[PDB]
């Protein structure tokens, strides 16, 4: 017989191995596959589809369907932003319920860009100008209009285009950022301000709503498969 | 750098290999714990045999992961880490035991009494596992009656799909010192492919 | 391992005449080369066909109570004419063996005799902190050979603490009565050195154990016999020494 | 390591109705059928009774049949052989084994019992 | 000097590393190697040689040399198989003492086929037909002849060929099966039944024996070196 | 073999990849532990905010390693494993919290009161981290004002380089059941390059 | 999981000067600004007071202003809203939240309080 | 699928790399534990020195593995993880110690008294290991007198092969506070090749 | 949306991963690098520069600057070596304070050669012959001149060349040796003996000193990044 | 870390026969030879006595010889220097060290002792 040698590692079962085992059913005719439309290849492709961000997670409005309707009120020109979203995936409760967030709860690292969309749902005739602004990592979330107005920002026109897109880049220190709340490494800050104010024709409801959608970009990737399932 | 136009995104892929479907599910997870024994005693409860219906539905870890889709095909690999020990507080002895594990293809007779004919089965595959060696392993390919396993089946006739049943018992006869043994079952779905992607079940199962 | 099915009975009688010796083999076919290596020459004094002829050891009797038998090489052949002399007249000697074990019985006898050739077969003495133990004579039975038991080798442990059911890792053939009468084993020279001191170190160990018991129809021969014929293959020695006449 | 402890073996007298019992360690009873074999003094081993608790499929020896009753527990994982109407030939050393099986056969068994002799002899 | 940087990992000894260390003996003439017949290259080559399966591990016959002689008795046509071997390597005590089994106690996974040989040792003249059958993974071991007769089986003729080979395939779920008793994932079932019965000439012993040999096939492989050695 | 001439050495490289500069420092190490909270109580100490100046100088592991050189340039990656728990011994409840982590580029206004304008910052990058997901990550490239970070600066005007400041607070309002949380910060210097190699600081820092 | 326990909520009577308090779990106060919102009976939520303890930047509602005082601790990590001169409209259910922020706005907040009602009603 | 002919087997290799001889034994295992000390006390027992004859025969793990064959050649790599600590319950102090480890080629004078000439050895290789750094390592190539090491030697003259002897002592002089130290020895046989394959020793050694 | 699948590993942060994360500062003009002389590429290049071995670590002379001056005394022809250095990196306190030693405290394994230099600092006119000897691994440190004189040794002439180099080879068992004090696997033994004796002109100081330098060779390498930092 | 604790050092008077002792931590005595060195007041260090317990190879200084006796234990791993017939010059601070060695030489030593002075002075 061929002179062999059992090295350390034999008689051990690796839960993440890749060996070939005896097939318990010889010649079983397997029903062939068909093109059922919607084949998926990788998880990072589910994130490439926008999901609606639950902006309002307040006491009464959290868990109800109103956790998506961002209401532009009939209040003054208070520079306090009309919405500030912390672009810190796990260190901020809001971005963790999105599809894009769900996939990021199955890994430890993430790289690439994330894009924000804002579909305005206001009485056709109604107009105005809002200022969607982003403040790069580390820098404190902009509190006054002018402040935000100096960082990366788009002055989105209600009257002209209904849907507003703003792609937040990948201005990161390391090559891979965290998905854990060890430290609050404040990434970006998607911030929306009243540039002008809303102008309404005749007597159309003075408080209409907006929706926000977040998704991954083609350059978005993840690593180190970890998980957390409970009982 | 700091740029916000409205392009598509920015650049092209940047390597995503470990996130692919095959590597998403390529991690074996416990699916159940089957307890047997060799009672000299007439314990018509544990009575040697222990039958478990092959369903992912029992464990959470593997469940949510599989629910992210509506349809799937997957060659199923099973691993059997069998561990034992003596029950009674006694310096009683035993010779190494041999366990028979039986995979029974979906839609067959399910064994009851550890006795009965259905334990001989001229057709049903079986694995005789001698104790104290590397755990046992068999791969049951896509045994679906349809073109895919329906994770969420809509409509009427819950028997989701039926991946079969596992029956384990001791082969050796009645030893004076009663020996208990737990049969851990692991399931690595391999060559997995999925279809329509649903939102993840948020709550508790 | 040795899953062969020649013919069954007898076809042809091909005789092996090497020098003065003449064996008439059952046929000749069904031969197993150990590890697939032939006995070659060290890559000396080559006594050729003079020291390369068939010597036949004692024919032992296989009975219903037989636990087995075992021999040592060169040892067994130390009392055989020329090869025996060349073994005691040199300090060096490397030589292979063509162990041809033949066993004849009737079409009314049943059983299985497996011939296991064990390289460096040290026999029973769980004394790791010290092998050899059993004296030279108790270790070298010679032509007569030693016997296994249920100087005490335990058969199921192949007489060395390793289950006989694994013995099949060594070169071997199973003489299964209903099949072949003959078993052929050519063992090339295996040793830690290039050439060695034949008197001291035992290169091989032919061990013939009973796999199946003997069962003769109603009443017949209470016992059959097994013969061992061995022959030195490509024998060399260095270098004579005062033909130390006895 | 699967343990089958053979208990309930003691001296009876021609017509005895004793009972034997064996526990199941390392495995669930239904995974292995369960049986018995007796080494008759100076004889080869003979199959006596065997069933698999999975669905309980009873099978007895030709001599043994009717009198002896093989039953199985899945809670305590024990096999109870009610050796009723014991006779002089039934003076043998029993052994409990787990099979596959599902009945009497020298081989086809994995784990074996230690040993216990039920002597069916009427003495004073 | 060349500007270097000590990264995390220095001053650590990995028990499974592979570095080059100073050779304590410079110029030591090493005795060259010779072709001692029987060089081995891999362990999986020791399994490629059949070893005798100890079928009978009963109380008295276990540990004695009779643990290999499978005796075909002078009993009736009871459909209870004349031998059923569970093809569950570690979850079945019998296949773990074979050479092929020994190597599988040094790993965790195994793939490929295993072949069974049956050398009949019965009085030349004696004849009969046995039925060696295999039941694929999961399905319960066949108890009746007919049952087994429907699954993969060879009707081996005693009278014609002495040695019977039956190659059990690799009909396995996963790509690598276990070598641990976690669960009794019943693989195959090598089963031998009395197809006919044994027929003996004149008065030759009516109870002769058989031997079984198991080995690996060229496609057989293992992974994840683990072990278990004790005191 | 045993040879002692006086050559150069003996042979040519023998593989040294894992000892290279990039792989020497490619191991993230804790740099600090910032503790926050959401006090319904007026604890003007921990008062939500916690500010830490980004300096390697605090931890030893990363320090000595960086001291083996005099100059360096390194794109800095930060990771934020955020963990929480309830303080008071009470069956009080809370909804998942969202923490805001702010990176502030070197030479900006450092936030004091958790309140003040400097927490809105139209320019300073921030990361809103919802709890119970993969830790947060941002990469701040070489933010040196010179051509390299001076590990040991000789001369006069210790403010070594200034890699910025991190401020973390809870965004959610005052919950009846007070929740403490520790923000671990990890720093993997990437694309690192170094210059003049000094002898290693032997002693204690 | 960040916890903000809303305590100090009880019945006052037109002109009351009660105080509310909330602890910070999982994070350091200065990492998140802190605020309050009231659900007026049958009305939408209104911002009341909010500051970030980092550098303490005070901001009040138009009605609320002057009377109410938002203060923050960094040692116990608590927010103390001194609700001075409480009036009949101020009969609402308060909630403490952490923002970014740094002031009154329906959104821009992360973790929310459970619930507490300060009833500003003069009764016997 | 389900097929039983009698071919050879079925197909061709399917990858077996990690089972190869080189990777079977490529795992270092403890071989012994040598205890030394620096006694100010005249403990003529432990008396600094500790000599151990290099034999695999002492440890089981490495033994069985090597017994699967009859002959072998293997370049032997040794690693020395040296650990220390103070004995007596006292706040006594010590400076970092330097241990001398000596490999002595098979068939040389074995050192007794920690004193004697045989500790200078103009020929025997030695390794001075300063404490508190990466463990020491030396590779002694195939030092067999034959063409292979005989695992099971048959015949007469147990001194299996003789792989040498290791002697370890403290070099520093007598410190007031007595320091004990354990010298763990690891052995990774490298470039290993084997010959005739025996059945594995089943029992206890 | 693209059908994806979250595998085990998601939502885990690997401290040694390598992913791409969002860059917190978009378009920040990074000050370009300049050729500041002395760029380093690998740590193993800092060892390639000789460092002075602290030979004398005696009570009074340890920690002071005299821990480098090896004084050739005015003593007899006692064969007791004038210096023996154990070439066992961590198992010998002296070689662990060298630069070459420092790098070896950041790994677990080391291979390749180490070279020793001896710069004699004695009154020009002064002469003599010393014998620098090396004894391969395992063999006991040479105590008598003759003994050492038979192993690998260079008879260095004071009068002729001031600086003496002796390259100690890589005669090692394994492919990678340890940097831990588990066992005292005595490697080499750099030993210096009085071949002749020192001869001094007129009345020049009869006790001058020597310095020793150790370094790595181009074939020197390390592996498995480990560390030990304390408080 | 190897520890050698230098004990047994005290004031004797011209003709004293005191003894010193040192334990071996971190290593086995036979792995390192053992010695002594004395710092004579205002002088350089001088080798006194050294042996390796492996096979016990005795070596003494020219002055010291005969009178002083170096002995080693392998059980307690201690070195016992019987300083017999102590004289006025022998009024020095001793130190125990482990070498390789196997004798008296300024260098060739690894671990060093803390310090102990045996004063050989006859006083009242």
Q: Is the peptide bond before G101 cis (omega within 30 degrees of 0)?
A: yes
Neighbours of chain H (3+ CB pairs under 8 A): A, C, E, I, J
- Give per-residue burial for A171-205: e unless 16+ CB within 10 Å, then b: bbbbbbbbbbbbbbbbbbbbbbbbbeebebeeeee
Please spell the DSSP secondary structure of A101-125, one letter per residue: HHHTTS-SEEES-EEEEEEEE--TT
The answer to whether the CB atoms of E123 and C192 lie below 8 A apart is: no
- Distance of alpha carbon G89 from alpha carbon B105, whole angstroms: 71
Please spell the DSSP secondary structure of G27-62, one letter per residue: S-BTTBEEEEEEE-TTS-EEEEEEE-EET----B-T
Give strand pairing partners of A118: A164, A212
Contact B116, D52 (CB under 8 A): yes
CA dihedral sign of residues H128, H133, H135, H137: negative
Is I208 in a helix, a strand, or coil? coil
Strands C31-33 and C182-187: parallel
First-to-last CA distance in chain B?
45
- Distance of alpha carbon D22 from alpha carbon B176, whole angstroms: 5
Contact I47, E4 (CB under 8 A): yes
Contact A40, I4 (CB under 8 A): yes
Task: Say which of A56, A59, A78 has its CB closest to residue G113.
Answer: A59
Picking from F36, F132, F93, the residue whose alpha carbon sits closest to that of residue G32 is F36
| Cβ within 8 Å of residue C2, ≥6 positions away | C32, C172, C173, C174
E99 secondary structure, DSSP code: H
Task: Say which of B81, B84, B120 has its CB closest to residue E140.
Answer: B120
| Cβ within 8 Å of residue B158, ≥6 positions away | none
Contact F98, A199 (CB under 8 A): no
Task: Say which of A108, A171, A228 has its CB closest to residue I17.
Answer: A108
What's the full length of chain E, in residues? 231
Task: Tell me the shortest Cα–Cα distance from F161 to chain A, in angstroms.
Answer: 16
Picking from I159, I150, I148, the residue whose alpha carbon sits closest to that of residue I79 is I148
Picking from B140, D3, B111, the residue whose alpha carbon sits closest to that of residue E185 is B140
| Cβ within 8 Å of residue B156, ≥6 positions away | none
- Distance of alpha carbon A217 from alpha carbon A168, whole angstroms: 10
What's the full length of chain B, in residues? 205
- Distance of alpha carbon F49 from alpha carbon F168, whole angstroms: 6
Task: Tell me the shortest Cα–Cα distance from H3 to chain C, in angstroms.
Answer: 20
C149 secondary structure, DSSP code: B
Is D112 in a helix, a strand, or coil? coil
Is residue H5 left, alpha or beta, with left meaning phi > 0 and alpha meaning psi from -120 to 50? alpha
CB count in 10 Å sphere of residue F111: 31
Please spell the DSSP secondary structure of chain B, one letter per residue: -------S-SS-----GGGBHHHHH-S-EEEEEEEEE-EES--TTBBS-EEEE--GGG-HHHHHHHHTSSEEEEEEEEEEEEEEEE-SSS----PPPEEEEEEE-SSSPPP-EESSGGGT-SSS-EEEEESSSSBEEEEE----SSSSEESS--S---------EEEEEE-SB--SS-EEEEEEEEEEEEEEEE---PPPP-S--
Please spell the DSSP secondary structure of F165-198, one letter per residue: EEEEEE-SB--SS-EEEEEEEEEEEEEEEE---P
| Cβ within 8 Å of residue D28, ≥6 positions away | B34, B35, B36, B37, B46, B48, B49, B50, B168, B169, B181, B183, D74, D77, E184
| Cβ within 8 Å of residue H49, ≥6 positions away | H36, H111, H112, H113, H114, H167, H168, H169, J28, J29, J30, J31, J32, J52, J53, J54, J74
- Distance of alpha carbon F118 from alpha carbon G8, whole angstroms: 30
Q: Which long-range contacts (CB under 8 A, 24 or more apart) does I32-37 make?
A: I32/F147, I33/F73, I33/F147, I33/F148, I33/F193, I34/F147, I36/F71, I36/F147, I36/F148, I36/F195, I36/F196, I37/F195
Mutate: best of C126, C138, C192, partner H, most H CBs <10 A: C192
- Distance of alpha carbon A103 from alpha carbon I15, whole angstroms: 20
Order of strands, sheet of J45-51, starting from the edge strand that comes earlier in the sequence: J45-51, J33-39, J92-99, J116-118
Is residue H48 left, alpha or beta, with left meaning phi > 0 and alpha meaning psi from -120 to 50? left
Which chain I residues contact residue B27 at CB under 8 A?
7-9
Strand (E) or helix (H) holding E101:
helix E99-103
Q: Is the peptide bond before B22 cis (omega within 30 degrees of 0)?
A: no
Picking from A3, E36, I138, the residue whose alpha carbon sits closest to that of residue H148 is E36
Give the residue from chain B lying closest to I29, CA to CA: B1
The answer to whether the CB atoms of I45 and E3 lie below 8 A apart is: yes
Please spell the DSSP secondary structure of chain F, one letter per residue: -------S-SS-----GGGBHHHHH-S-EEEEEEEEE-EES--TTBBS-EEEE--GGG-HHHHHHHHTSSEEEEEEEEEEEEEEEE-SSS----PPPEEEEEEE-SSSPPP-EESSGGGT-SSS-EEEEESSSSBEEEEE----SSSSEESS--S---------EEEEEE-SB--SS-EEEEEEEEEEEEEEEE---PPPP-S--
Strand (E) or helix (H) holding I166:
strand I163-168
Picking from I95, I129, I108, I98, the residue whose alpha carbon sits closest to that of residue I182 is I108
- Distance of alpha carbon H116 from alpha carbon J70, whole angstroms: 12
CA dist E39 to B171, E197, G53, H18, H197, Å?
40, 45, 76, 18, 9
Contact F31, G10 (CB under 8 A): no
- Distance of alpha carbon D64 from alpha carbon D68, whole angstroms: 6
Is I94 in a helix, a strand, or coil? helix
CB count in 10 Å sphere of residue F13: 12
G59 near A CB under 8 A: yes
Question: Counting beta carbons within 10 angstroms of the beta carbon of residue E125, is it exposed (0 to 12), middle (13 to 18) or buried (19 or more)?
Answer: middle
First-to-last CA distance in chain I?
53
Question: Counting beta carbons within 10 angstroms of the beta carbon of residue C147, is it exposed (0 to 12), middle (13 to 18) or buried (19 or more)?
Answer: middle
CA dist G9 to F170, G2, G16, G20, G82, Å?
21, 21, 12, 6, 11
Give strand pairing partners of B34: B183
What's the full length of chain H, in residues? 205
Discontinuities in chain I (C→N > 2.5 Å), after residue:
none
The answer to whether the CB atoms of G45 and A82 lie below 8 A apart is: no
Which chain E residues contact residue B137 at CB under 8 A?
109-110, 172, 174, 176-179, 185, 187
- Distance of alpha carbon A152 from alpha carbon A168, whole angstroms: 9
Q: Do chains B and D touch (3 or more CB pairs under 8 A)?
A: yes
User: Biggest alpha carbon distance in chain E?
Assistant: 97
C10 near E CB under 8 A: no
- Distance of alpha carbon J112 from alpha carbon J106, whole angstroms: 12
The answer to whether the CB atoms of H196 and C120 lie below 8 A apart is: yes
The answer to whether the CB atoms of E37 and C213 lie below 8 A apart is: no
The answer to whether the CB atoms of F10 and I219 lie below 8 A apart is: yes
Angle at B89 between CA B88 and CA B95, to 5 degrees: 65
- Distance of alpha carbon C83 from alpha carbon H138, whole angstroms: 48
CB count in 10 Å sphere of residue H16: 21
Strand blocks (E) in C36-86: 55-56, 60-62, 69-70
Please spell the DSSP secondary structure of E160-191, one letter per residue: T-SEEEEEE--B-SSSSEE-BBSS----EEEE
Picking from B8, I23, I8, the residue whose alpha carbon sits closest to that of residue A110 is I23
- Distance of alpha carbon C1 from alpha carbon B184, whole angstroms: 35
Q: Report phi then psi at F67, rounded to 5.
A: -75, -20
The answer to whether the CB atoms of I83 and J111 lie below 8 A apart is: no
I161 secondary structure, DSSP code: -
Contact A121, A209 (CB under 8 A): yes
The answer to whether the CB atoms of I22 and A111 lie below 8 A apart is: yes
- Distance of alpha carbon H98 from alpha carbon J111, whole angstroms: 6
- Distance of alpha carbon A20 from alpha carbon A6, whole angstroms: 18
Give the residue from chain H lying closest to J9, CA to CA: H176
Q: Report phi then psi at G96, rounded to 5.
A: -95, 130
Q: Report phi then psi at F65, rounded to 5.
A: -50, -45
Task: Say which of B38, B41, B180 has its CB closest to residue D111.
Answer: B38
- Distance of alpha carbon A1 from alpha carbon D110, whole angstroms: 29
Give the residue from chain B lying closest to A176, CA to CA: B14
The answer to whether the CB atoms of B134 and A13 lie below 8 A apart is: yes
Torsion of CA A87, A88, A93, A98, to 10 degrees: 60
| Cβ within 8 Å of residue E75, ≥6 positions away | none
Contact C116, C207 (CB under 8 A): yes
- Distance of alpha carbon E120 from alpha carbon E135, whole angstroms: 22
Contact D4, D23 (CB under 8 A): yes
Task: Say which of A153, A174, A226 has its CB closest to residue F188.
Answer: A174
Task: Say which of A106, A137, A181 has its CB closest to residue F125.
Answer: A137
The answer to whether the CB atoms of E27 and F2 lie below 8 A apart is: yes
- Distance of alpha carbon C120 from alpha carbon C189, whole angstroms: 11
Task: Say which of E3, E13, E20 has its CB closest to residue I39.
Answer: E3
- Distance of alpha carbon A202 from alpha carbon D119, whole angstroms: 109
Question: Counting beta carbons within 10 angstroms of the beta carbon of residue F151, is it exposed (0 to 12), middle (13 to 18) or buried (19 or more)?
Answer: buried
The answer to whether the CB atoms of F114 and G37 lie below 8 A apart is: no
Rg (CA), chain I: 24
Task: Say which of A39, A103, A221 has its CB closest to residue B15.
Answer: A221
Which chain A residues contact residue F76 at CB under 8 A?
173-174
What is the three-state SS of G7-27?
A: ECCCCECCCCCCEEEEECCEC
- Distance of alpha carbon F79 from alpha carbon I16, whole angstroms: 12
Contact E8, F27 (CB under 8 A): yes
Task: Say which of J26, J57, J108 has its CB closest to residue I181.
Answer: J26
Contact F171, F181 (CB under 8 A): no
Please spell the DSSP secondary structure of E112-136, one letter per residue: S-EEEEEEEE--TT-B-EEEEEE--
- Give per-residue burial for J56-94: e unless 16+ CB within 10 Å, then b: bbbbbbeebeeebbbbbbbebbbbbbebeebeeebbbbb
| Cβ within 8 Å of residue H108, ≥6 positions away | H124, H164, H165, I139
Contact I44, I103 (CB under 8 A): yes
CA D88 to the chain's CA centroid: 17
Q: Is the peptide bond before D101 cis (omega within 30 degrees of 0)?
A: yes
Torsion of CA D94, D98, D101, D102, to 10 degrees: 60
Order of strands, sheet of D68-72, starting from the edge strand that comes earlier in the sequence: B39-40, D19-23, D79-83, D68-72
Q: Do chains A and E touch (3 or more CB pairs under 8 A)?
A: yes
Angle at E166 between CA B124 and CA B123, to 5 degrees: 10
Give the residue from chain F lying closest to A106, CA to CA: F134
Strands F39-40 and J45-51: unpaired
Which chain A residues contact residue B145 at CB under 8 A?
31
- Distance of alpha carbon J93 from alpha carbon H36, whole angstroms: 26
Picking from D23, D31, D72, the residue whose alpha carbon sits closest to that of residue D50 is D72
Q: Do chains B and J touch (3 or more CB pairs under 8 A)?
A: no
Please report the resolution in angstroms.
5.3
Picking from I159, I151, I136, I160, the residue whose alpha carbon sits closest to that of residue I193 is I151
Task: Tell me the shortest Cα–Cα distance from F156 to chain I, in angstroms.
Answer: 21
Question: Counting beta carbons within 10 angstroms of the beta carbon of residue I212, is it exposed (0 to 12), middle (13 to 18) or buried (19 or more)?
Answer: buried
Interface of H with E in 167-196 (CB under 8 A): 186, 193-196
Contact G74, G102 (CB under 8 A): no
CB count in 10 Å sphere of residue I1: 16
Is residue I41 left, alpha or beta, with left meaning phi > 0 and alpha meaning psi from -120 to 50? alpha
- Distance of alpha carbon B20 from alpha carbon D61, whole angstroms: 59
- Distance of alpha carbon B126 from alpha carbon H26, whole angstroms: 36
- Distance of alpha carbon B188 from alpha carbon E177, whole angstroms: 10
- Distance of alpha carbon E196 from alpha carbon B159, whole angstroms: 43
Rg (CA), chain A: 24
Rg (CA), chain H: 22
| Cβ within 8 Å of residue B182, ≥6 positions away | B33, B34, B35, B36, B82, B83, B84, D26, E182
Which chain A residues contact residue E43 at CB under 8 A?
4-7, 10
Task: Say which of F9, F12, F21 has its CB closest to residue I42.
Answer: F21
CB count in 10 Å sphere of residue A103: 29
Contact B91, B40 (CB under 8 A): no
The answer to whether the CB atoms of I43 and F61 lie below 8 A apart is: no
The answer to whether the CB atoms of G100 and A82 lie below 8 A apart is: no
Strand (E) or helix (H) holding G118:
strand G116-118
CA dist B162 to A195, B73, B146, B147, J38, Å?
60, 13, 11, 14, 87
Contact G10, G121 (CB under 8 A): no
Q: Report phi then psi at F30, rounded to 5.
A: -55, 145
CA H153 to the chain's CA centroid: 21
- Distance of alpha carbon E50 from alpha carbon H8, whole angstroms: 13
Contact I229, E17 (CB under 8 A): no
Could you tell me how many helices (H) and strands (E) chain H has, helices first?
2, 11
């Amino acid at each position: 017989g061929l002179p062999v040698m059992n090295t350390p590692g034999s008689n051990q079962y690796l839960t993440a191995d890749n060996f070939q085992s005896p097939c318990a059913l010889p010649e079983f005719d397997v029903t062939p596959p068909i093109d059922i439309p919607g084949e998926v290849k990788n998880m990072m492709e589910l994130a490439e589809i926008d999901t609606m961000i639950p902006f309002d997670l307040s006491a009464t409005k959290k868990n109800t369907m109103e956790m998506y309707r961002v209401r532009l009120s009939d209040k003054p020109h208070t520079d306090d932003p009309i919405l500030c979203l912390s672009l810190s995936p796990a260190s901020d409760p809001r971005l963790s319920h999105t599809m894009l967030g769900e996939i990021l709860n199955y890994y430890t690292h993430w790289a690439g860009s994330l894009k924000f969309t804002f579909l305005f749902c206001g009485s056709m005739m109604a107009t105005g100008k809002l200022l969607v602004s982003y403040a790069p990592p580390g820098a404190d979330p902009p509190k006054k209009r002018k402040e935000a107005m100096l960082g990366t920002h788009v002055i989105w026109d209600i009257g002209l285009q209904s849907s507003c897109t703003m792609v937040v880049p990948w201005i990161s220190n390391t090559t891979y950022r965290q998905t854990i709340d060890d430290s609050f490494t404040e990434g970006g800050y998607i911030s929306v301000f009243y540039q002008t104010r809303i102008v309404v024709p005749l007597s159309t409801p003075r408080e209409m709503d907006i929706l926000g959608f977040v998704s991954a970009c083609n350059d978005f990737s993840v690593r180190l498969l970890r998980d957390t399932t409970h009982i | 750098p700091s740029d916000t136009v409205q392009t598509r995104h920015v650049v092209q892929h940047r390597s995503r290999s470990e996130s692919s479907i095959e590597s998403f599910f390529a991690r074996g997870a416990c699916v159940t714990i089957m307890t047997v024994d060799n009672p000299a005693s007439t314990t018509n409860k544990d009575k040697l045999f222990a039958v478990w219906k092959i369903t992912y539905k029992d464990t959470v870890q593997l469940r949510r992961k599989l629910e992210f889709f509506t349809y799937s095909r997957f060659d199923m690999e099973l691993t059997f880490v069998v561990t034992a020990n003596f029950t009674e507080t006694n310096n009683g002895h035993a010779l190494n035991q041999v366990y028979q594990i039986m995979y029974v293809p979906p839609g067959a007779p399910v064994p009851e009494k550890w006795d009965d004919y259905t334990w001989q089965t001229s057709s049903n595959p079986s694995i005789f596992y001698t104790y104290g060696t590397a755990p046992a392993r068999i791969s049951v390919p896509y045994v679906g009656i349809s073109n895919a396993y329906s994770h969420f089946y809509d409509g009427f006739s819950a028997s989701l799909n039926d991946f079969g049943i596992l029956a384990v018992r001791v082969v050796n006869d009645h030893n004076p010192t009663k020996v208990t043994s737990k049969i851990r079952v692991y399931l690595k779905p391999k060559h997995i492919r999925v279809w329509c992607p649903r939102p993840p079940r948020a709550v508790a199962y | 391992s040795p899953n062969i099915e020649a013919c069954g009975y007898s076809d042809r009688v091909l005789q092996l005449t090497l020098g003065n010796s003449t064996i008439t083999t059952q046929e000749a076919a069904n031969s197993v080369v150990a590890y697939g290596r032939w006995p070659e020459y060290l890559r000396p004094t080559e006594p050729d066909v003079a020291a390369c002829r068939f010597y036949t050891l004692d024919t032992v009797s296989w009975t219903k109570e037989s636990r087995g038998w075992w021999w040592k090489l060169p040892d067994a052949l130390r009392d055989m004419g020329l090869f025996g002399q060349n073994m005691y007249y040199h300090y060096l000697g490397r030589s292979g063996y063509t162990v041809h074990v033949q066993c004849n019985a009737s079409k009314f006898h049943q059983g299985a005799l497996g011939v296991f050739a064990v390289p460096e077969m040290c026999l029973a003495g769980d004394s790791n902190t010290t092998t050899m133990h059993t004296s030279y004579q108790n270790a070298n039975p010679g032509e007569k050979g030693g016997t296994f038991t249920g100087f005490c080798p335990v058969d199921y442990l192949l007489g060395n603490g390793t289950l006989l059911g694994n013995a099949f890792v060594f070169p071997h053939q199973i003489i299964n009565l209903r099949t072949n009468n003959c078993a052929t084993l050519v063992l090339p020279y295996v040793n830690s050195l290039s050439i060695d001191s034949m008197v001291k170190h035992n290169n091989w160990g032919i061990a013939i154990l009973p796999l199946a018991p003997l069962n003769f129809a109603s009443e017949s021969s209470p016992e059959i016999p097994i013969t061992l014929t061995i022959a030195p293959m490509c024998c060399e020695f260095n270098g004579l020494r005062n033909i130390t006449l006895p | 390591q699967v343990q089958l402890q053979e208990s309930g073996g003691g001296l009876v007298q021609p017509g005895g109705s004793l009972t034997l019992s064996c526990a199941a360690s390392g495995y669930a009873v239904s995974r292995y059928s369960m049986g018995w074999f007796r080494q008759a003094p100076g004889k080869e081993n003979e199959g006596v009774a065997a069933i698999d608790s999975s669905g309980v499929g009873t099978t007895y020896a030709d001599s043994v049949k009717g009198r002896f009753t093989i039953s199985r527990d899945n809670a305590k994982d024990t096999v109870y052989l009610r050796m009723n109407s014991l006779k002089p030939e039934d003076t043998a050393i029993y052994y409990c084994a787990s099979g596959f099986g599902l009945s009497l056969s020298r081989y086809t068994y994995a784990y074996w019992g230690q040993g216990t002799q039920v002597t069916v002899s009427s003495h004073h």
